[PDB]
Short mmCIF file of C-alpha atoms and ligand atoms in Angstrom, two decimals:
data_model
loop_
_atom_site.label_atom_id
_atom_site.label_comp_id
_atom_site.label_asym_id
_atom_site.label_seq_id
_atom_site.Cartn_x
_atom_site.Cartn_y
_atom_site.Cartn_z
CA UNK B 2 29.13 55.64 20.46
CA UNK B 3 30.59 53.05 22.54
CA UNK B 4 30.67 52.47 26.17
CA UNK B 5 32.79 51.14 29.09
CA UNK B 6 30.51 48.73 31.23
CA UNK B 7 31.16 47.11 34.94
CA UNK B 8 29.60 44.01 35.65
CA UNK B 9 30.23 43.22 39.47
CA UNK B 10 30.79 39.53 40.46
CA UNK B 11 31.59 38.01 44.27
CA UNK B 12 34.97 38.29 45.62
CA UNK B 13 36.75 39.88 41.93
CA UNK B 14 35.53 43.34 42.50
CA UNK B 15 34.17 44.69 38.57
CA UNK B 16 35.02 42.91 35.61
CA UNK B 17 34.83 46.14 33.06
CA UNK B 18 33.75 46.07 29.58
CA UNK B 19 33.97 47.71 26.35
CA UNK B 20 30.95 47.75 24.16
CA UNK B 21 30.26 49.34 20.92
CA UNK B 22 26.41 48.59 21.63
CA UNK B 23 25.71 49.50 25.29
CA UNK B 24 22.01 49.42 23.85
CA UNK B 25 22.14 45.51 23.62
CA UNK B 26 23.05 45.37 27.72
CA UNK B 27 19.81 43.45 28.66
CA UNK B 28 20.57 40.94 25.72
CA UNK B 29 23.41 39.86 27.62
CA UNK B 30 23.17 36.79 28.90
CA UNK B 31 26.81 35.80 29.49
CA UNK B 32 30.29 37.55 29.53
CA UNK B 33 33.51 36.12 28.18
CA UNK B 34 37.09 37.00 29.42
CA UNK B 35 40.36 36.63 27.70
CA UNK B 36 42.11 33.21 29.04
CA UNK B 37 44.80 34.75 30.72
CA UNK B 38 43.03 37.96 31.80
CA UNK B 39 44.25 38.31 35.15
CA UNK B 40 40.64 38.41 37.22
CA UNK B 41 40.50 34.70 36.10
CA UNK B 42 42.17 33.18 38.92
CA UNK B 43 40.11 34.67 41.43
CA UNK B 44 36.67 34.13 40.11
CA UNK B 45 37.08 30.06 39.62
CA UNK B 46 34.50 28.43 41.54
CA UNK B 47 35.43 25.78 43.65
CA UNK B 48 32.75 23.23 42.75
CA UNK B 49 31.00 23.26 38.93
CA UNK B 50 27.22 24.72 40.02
CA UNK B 51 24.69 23.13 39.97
CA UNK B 52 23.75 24.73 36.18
CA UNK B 53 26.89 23.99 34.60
CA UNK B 54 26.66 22.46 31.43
CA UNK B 55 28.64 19.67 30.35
CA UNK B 56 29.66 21.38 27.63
CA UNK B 57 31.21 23.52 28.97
CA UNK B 58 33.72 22.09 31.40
CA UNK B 59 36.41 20.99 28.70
CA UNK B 60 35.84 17.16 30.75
CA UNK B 61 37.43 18.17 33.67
CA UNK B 62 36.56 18.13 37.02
CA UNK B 63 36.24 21.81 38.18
CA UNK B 64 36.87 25.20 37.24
CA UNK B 65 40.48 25.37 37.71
CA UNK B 66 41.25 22.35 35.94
CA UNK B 67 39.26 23.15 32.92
CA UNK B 68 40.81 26.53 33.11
CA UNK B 69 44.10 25.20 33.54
CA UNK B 70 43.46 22.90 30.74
CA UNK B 71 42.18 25.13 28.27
CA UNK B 72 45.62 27.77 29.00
CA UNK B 73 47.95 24.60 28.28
CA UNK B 74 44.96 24.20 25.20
CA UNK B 75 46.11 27.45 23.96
CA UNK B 76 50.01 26.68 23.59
CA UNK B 77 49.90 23.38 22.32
CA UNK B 78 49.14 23.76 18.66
CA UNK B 79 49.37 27.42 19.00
CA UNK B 87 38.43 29.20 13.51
CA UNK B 88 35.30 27.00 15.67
CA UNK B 89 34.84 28.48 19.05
CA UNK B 90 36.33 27.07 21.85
CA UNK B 91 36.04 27.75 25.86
CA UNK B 92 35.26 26.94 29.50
CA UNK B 93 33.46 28.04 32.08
CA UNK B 94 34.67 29.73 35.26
CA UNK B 95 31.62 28.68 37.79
CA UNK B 96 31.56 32.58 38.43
CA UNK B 97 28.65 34.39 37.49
CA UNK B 98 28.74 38.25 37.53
CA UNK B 99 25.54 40.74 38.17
CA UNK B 100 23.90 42.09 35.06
CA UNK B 101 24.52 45.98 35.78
CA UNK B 102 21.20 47.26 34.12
CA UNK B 103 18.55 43.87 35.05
CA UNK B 104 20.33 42.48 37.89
CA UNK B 105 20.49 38.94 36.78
CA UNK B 106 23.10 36.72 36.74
CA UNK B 107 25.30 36.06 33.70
CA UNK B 108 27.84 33.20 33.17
CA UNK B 109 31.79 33.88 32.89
CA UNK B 110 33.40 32.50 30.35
CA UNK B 111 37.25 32.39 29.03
CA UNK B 112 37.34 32.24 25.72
CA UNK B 113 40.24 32.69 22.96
CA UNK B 114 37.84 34.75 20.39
CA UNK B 115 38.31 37.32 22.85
CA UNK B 116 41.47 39.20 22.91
CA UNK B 117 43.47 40.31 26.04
CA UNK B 118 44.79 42.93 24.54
CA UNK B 119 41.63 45.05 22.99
CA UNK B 120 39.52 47.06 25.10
CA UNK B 121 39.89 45.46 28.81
CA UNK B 122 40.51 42.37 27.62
CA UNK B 123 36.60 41.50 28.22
CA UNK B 124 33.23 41.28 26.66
CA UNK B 125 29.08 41.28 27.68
CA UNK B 126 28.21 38.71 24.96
CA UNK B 127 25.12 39.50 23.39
CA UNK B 128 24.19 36.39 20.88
CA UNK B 129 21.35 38.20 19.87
CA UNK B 130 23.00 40.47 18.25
CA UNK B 131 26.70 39.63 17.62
CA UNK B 132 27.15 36.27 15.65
CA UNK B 133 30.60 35.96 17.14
CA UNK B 134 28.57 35.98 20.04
CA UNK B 135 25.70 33.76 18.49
CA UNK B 136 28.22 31.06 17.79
CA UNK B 137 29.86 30.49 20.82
CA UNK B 138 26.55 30.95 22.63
CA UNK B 139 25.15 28.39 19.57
CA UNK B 140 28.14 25.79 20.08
CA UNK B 141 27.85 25.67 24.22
CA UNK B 142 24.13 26.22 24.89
CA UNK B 143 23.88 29.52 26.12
CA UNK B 144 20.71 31.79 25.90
CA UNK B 145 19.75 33.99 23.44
CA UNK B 146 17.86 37.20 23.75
CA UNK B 147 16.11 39.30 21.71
CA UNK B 148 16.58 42.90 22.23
CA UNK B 149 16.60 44.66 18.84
CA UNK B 150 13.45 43.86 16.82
CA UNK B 151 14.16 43.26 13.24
CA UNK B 152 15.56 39.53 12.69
CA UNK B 153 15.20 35.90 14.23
CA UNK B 154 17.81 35.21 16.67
CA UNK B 155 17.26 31.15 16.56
CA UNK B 156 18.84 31.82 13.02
CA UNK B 157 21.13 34.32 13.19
CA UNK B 158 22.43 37.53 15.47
CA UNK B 159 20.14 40.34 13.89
CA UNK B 160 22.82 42.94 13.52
CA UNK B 161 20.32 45.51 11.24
CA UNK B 162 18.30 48.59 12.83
CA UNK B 163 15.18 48.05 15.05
CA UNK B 164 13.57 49.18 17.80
CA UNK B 165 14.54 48.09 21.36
CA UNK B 166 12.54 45.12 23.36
CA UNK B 167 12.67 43.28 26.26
CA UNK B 168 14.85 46.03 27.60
CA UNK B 169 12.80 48.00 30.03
CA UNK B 170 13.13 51.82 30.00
CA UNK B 171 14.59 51.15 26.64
CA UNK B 172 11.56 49.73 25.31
CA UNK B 173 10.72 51.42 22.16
CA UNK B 174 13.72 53.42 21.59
CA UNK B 175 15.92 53.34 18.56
CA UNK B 176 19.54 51.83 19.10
CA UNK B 177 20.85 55.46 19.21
CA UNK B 178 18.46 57.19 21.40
CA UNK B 179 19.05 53.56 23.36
CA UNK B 180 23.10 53.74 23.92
CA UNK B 181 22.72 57.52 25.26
CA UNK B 182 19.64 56.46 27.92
CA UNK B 183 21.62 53.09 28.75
CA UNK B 184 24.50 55.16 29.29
CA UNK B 185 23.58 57.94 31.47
CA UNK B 186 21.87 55.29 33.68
CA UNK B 187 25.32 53.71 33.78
CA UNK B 188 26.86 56.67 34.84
CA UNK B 189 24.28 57.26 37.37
CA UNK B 190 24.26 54.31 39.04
CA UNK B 191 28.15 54.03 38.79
CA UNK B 192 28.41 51.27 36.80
CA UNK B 193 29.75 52.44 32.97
CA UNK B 194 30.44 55.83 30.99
CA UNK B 195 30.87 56.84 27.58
CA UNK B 196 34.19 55.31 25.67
N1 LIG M 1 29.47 41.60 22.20
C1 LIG M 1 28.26 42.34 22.62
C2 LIG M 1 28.35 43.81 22.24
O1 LIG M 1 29.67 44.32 22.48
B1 LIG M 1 30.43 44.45 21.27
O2 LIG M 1 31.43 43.43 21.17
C3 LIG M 1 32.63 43.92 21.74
C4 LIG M 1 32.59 45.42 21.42
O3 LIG M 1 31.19 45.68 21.25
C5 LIG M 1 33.39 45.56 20.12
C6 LIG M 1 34.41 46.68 20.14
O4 LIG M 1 35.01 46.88 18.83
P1 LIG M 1 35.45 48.35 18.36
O5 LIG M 1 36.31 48.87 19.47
O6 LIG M 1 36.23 48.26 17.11
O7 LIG M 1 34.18 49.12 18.18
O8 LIG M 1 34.07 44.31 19.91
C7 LIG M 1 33.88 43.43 20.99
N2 LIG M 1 35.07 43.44 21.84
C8 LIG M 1 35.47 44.34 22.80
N3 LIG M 1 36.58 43.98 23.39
C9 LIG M 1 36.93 42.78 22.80
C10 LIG M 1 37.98 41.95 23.01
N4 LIG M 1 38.89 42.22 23.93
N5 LIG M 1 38.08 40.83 22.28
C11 LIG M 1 37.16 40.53 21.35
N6 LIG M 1 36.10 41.33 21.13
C12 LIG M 1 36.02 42.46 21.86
C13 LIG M 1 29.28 44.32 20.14
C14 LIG M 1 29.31 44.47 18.76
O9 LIG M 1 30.51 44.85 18.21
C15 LIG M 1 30.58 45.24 16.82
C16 LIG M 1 31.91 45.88 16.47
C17 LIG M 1 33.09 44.91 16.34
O10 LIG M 1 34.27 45.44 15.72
C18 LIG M 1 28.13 44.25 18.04
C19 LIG M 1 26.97 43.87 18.69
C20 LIG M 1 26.94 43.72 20.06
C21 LIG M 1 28.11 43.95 20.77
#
């Protein structure tokens, strides 16, 4: 079944996660917060990185303007997917790499903790912010074409390490006992 995640990123201790596919964890290559989820404020960059994509700035000139922006964004004429970027990026908790931190209104403060991994692989809400702001893709469940679609159907895990191989239920109970073992998820 599901799964509660913690991606750590500098200076805003764990940003925690509630999946319904801890299987897809190495698919995720970015992680989007609810706008006013209160780790927000501290994890704004000073400067846009060097990486930062236009696109994903809302025009402004650095993370707490955009962010600032996209807030007052929200109450003004309070769909397409919409968002900004932080400048924060958090540590993958099962590969180690970085991933991007978003805010984004398709995600809900309220449900869950109020933050996602996105996997656009595998999640088309996912797929079409990550399709609409350049972000990358990853296969990790074989069975579809992710530069069409997210491949939501059955398949055997990829790109995914000790998960290689595995089917997606055999894959959330591995995934998760490595969380718990390594402190950084259990079972939800
Ligand atoms: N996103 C990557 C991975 O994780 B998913 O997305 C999170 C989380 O799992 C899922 C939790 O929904 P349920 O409690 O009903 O199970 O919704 C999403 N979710 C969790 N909290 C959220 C929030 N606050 N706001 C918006 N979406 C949220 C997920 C999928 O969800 C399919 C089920 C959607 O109803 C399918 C494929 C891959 C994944």
């Amino acid at each position: 079944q599901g799964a509660s995640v913690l991606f750590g990123a500098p200076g805003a201790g764990d940003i925690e996660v509630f999946t319904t596919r801890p299987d897809t964890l190495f698919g995720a290559t970015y992680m989007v917060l609810a706008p006013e989820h209160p780790l927000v404020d501290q994890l704004a960059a000073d400067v846009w990185p060097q990486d930062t994509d236009p696109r994903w700035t809302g025009g402004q000139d650095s993370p707490r303007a955009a962010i600032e922006q996209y807030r007052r964004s929200i109450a003004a004429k309070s769909k397409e997917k919409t968002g900004v970027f932080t400048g924060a990026y958090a540590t993958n908790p099962v590969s180690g790499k970085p991933v991007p931190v978003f805010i984004a209104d398709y995600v809900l403060l309220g449900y869950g903790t109020g933050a996602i991994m996105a996997v656009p692989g595998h999640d088309q809400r996912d797929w079409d912010f990550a399709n609409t702001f350049g972000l990358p893709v990853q296969e990790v469940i074989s069975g579809g074409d992710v530069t069409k679609a997210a491949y939501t159907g059955d398949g055997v895990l990829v790109n995914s390490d000790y998960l290689d191989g595995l089917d997606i239920e055999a894959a959330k109970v591995e995934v998760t006992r490595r969380l718990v073992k390594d402190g950084r998820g259990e079972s939800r």
